[PDB]
């Protein structure tokens, strides 16, 4: 001591800087980070990292059967470039890289499982073992089912677009490695629905939900890690002090380090042995509970759409790079 709020928090929670690009990963050195379409779009703007994009195109060209089409090339490249960038992240960070599974497959268990397997085998081909990877999947019924299958073969999953207790419990019962609820998106939905201008501290509906999920998971002895993410304000983070992980904007990290005073570990549950109900949500109950939760079903649907938009934009960028690559060869001696 004296102990900053950040130092207190770090004694209770694995704190990870929220990063969306490689420069920020290098700067902040987060324990965990993510390869996804948006990070790669960001990198395309960088004269260093864009070369790694062109390399994925070249590698995909080498990989495919003779006579491949441009469509087949772009598809294969989307896979390879995601892995190239994940390997680049693993050279910087000490922990795990979340690897986004194409969100367009979010309602297809078999396709999600097959894509995860493909990405894991690509990582293996490039010298990276599966324990360094989290396969990141939207928490639809089908995505959780795919993760259930994957976990059984030792492929660790991060279940994201996770908004309610129903989704959390379904993941826990399926032995999912990690869930990443987006707290600030839950807050946003309630403000947007009601015109309430704020939900302060413990009243924040995202904080309420993640608090409940954490308490249940620990009391029941579930192994699934809870990573609170996507924060709108610093009070949300403080309310969830003691969560397994919290992904936090660099500016909030700096502010917590500046602050003094007392931070209470609110998320402090441990295993209990008692007669409380063990909740289960089989497919029908899951679907009905989701239907009744307008917040979770809309934020899940919008999130999937947003992920799908960014992967479509990636595909468009790869088409551009291919064109540029061809032009450069034709005009060079
Ligand atoms: Cl669903
Ligand atoms: Cl506002
Ligand atoms: Cl050339
Ligand atoms: Na191939
Ligand atoms: Na992909
Ligand atoms: Na696809
Ligand atoms: Na408080
Ligand atoms: Na913790
Ligand atoms: Na995306």
Curated annotation (Swiss-Prot):
Gene3D superfamilies per record: Aldolase class I (3.20.20.70)
Superkingdom: Bacteria
Active site per the UniProt annotation: 136 (schiff-base intermediate with substrate)
SUPFAM superfamilies: Aldolase
Reactions that this protein is recorded to catalyse: D-sedoheptulose 7-phosphate + D-glyceraldehyde 3-phosphate = D-erythrose 4-phosphate + beta-D-fructose 6-phosphate
PROSITE patterns (alphabetical): TRANSALDOLASE_1, TRANSALDOLASE_2
GO biological process annotation, one example: pentose-phosphate shunt
One Pfam family linked to the record: TAL_FSA
Annotated EC: 2.2.1.2
Subcellular location: Cytoplasm
GO molecular function: transaldolase activity
Main localization of the protein described in the UniProt heading: cytoplasm
Keywords from the UniProt entry: Cytoplasm, Pentose shunt, Schiff base, Transferase
Task of the protein: Transaldolase is important for the balance of metabolites in the pentose-phosphate pathway.
Subunit structure: Homodimer.
Full protein name: Transaldolase
Protein source organism: Prochlorococcus marinus (strain MIT 9312)
């Amino acid at each position: 001591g004296m102990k900053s709020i950040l130092e207190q928090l770090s004694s209770m929670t694995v704190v990870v800087a929220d990063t969306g690009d490689l420069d920020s990963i290098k700067k902040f050195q987060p324990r965990d980070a993510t390869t996804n379409p948006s990070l790669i779009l960001a990198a395309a703007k960088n004269p260093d990292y864009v070369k790694l994009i062109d390399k994925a195109i070249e590698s995909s060209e080498n990989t495919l059967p003779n006579g491949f089409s441009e469509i087949e090339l772009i598809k294969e490249t989307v896979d390879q470039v995601s892995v190239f960038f994940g390997k680049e992240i693993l050279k910087i960070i000490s922990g795990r890289v979340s690897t986004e599974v194409d969100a367009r497959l979010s309602f297809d268990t078999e396709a999600t499982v097959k894509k995860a397997r493909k990405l894991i085998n690509l990582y293996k081909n490039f010298g990276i073992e599966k324990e360094r990877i989290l396969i990141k999947i939207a928490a639809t019924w089908e995505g959780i089912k795919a993760a259930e299958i994957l976990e059984k073969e030792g492929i660790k999953c991060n279940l994201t677009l996770l908004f309610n207790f129903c989704q959390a419990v379904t993941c826990a019962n399926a032995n999912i490695t990690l869930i990443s609820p987006f707290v600030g998106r839950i807050l946003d939905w309630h403000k947007a629905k009601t015109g309430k201008t704020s939900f302060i501290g413990a009243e924040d509906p995202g904080v309420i939900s993640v608090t409940q999920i954490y308490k249940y998971f620990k009391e029941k002895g579930f192994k699934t890690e809870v990573m609170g993410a996507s924060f709108r304000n610093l009070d949300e983070i403080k309310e969830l002090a003691g969560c397994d992980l919290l992904t936090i904007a660099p500016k909030f990290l700096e502010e917590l380090k500046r602050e003094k005073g007392v931070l209470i570990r609110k998320l402090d549950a441990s295993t209990k042995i008692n007669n409380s109900i063990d909740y289960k949500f089989e497919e029908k109950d899951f679907r009905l509970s989701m239907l009744e939760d307008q917040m979770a079903s809309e934020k899940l649907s919008e999130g999937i759409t947003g992920f799908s938009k960014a992967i479509e934009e990636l595909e468009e960028l790869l088409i551009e790079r291919l064109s540029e690559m061809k032009n450069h060869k034709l005009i060079s001696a």
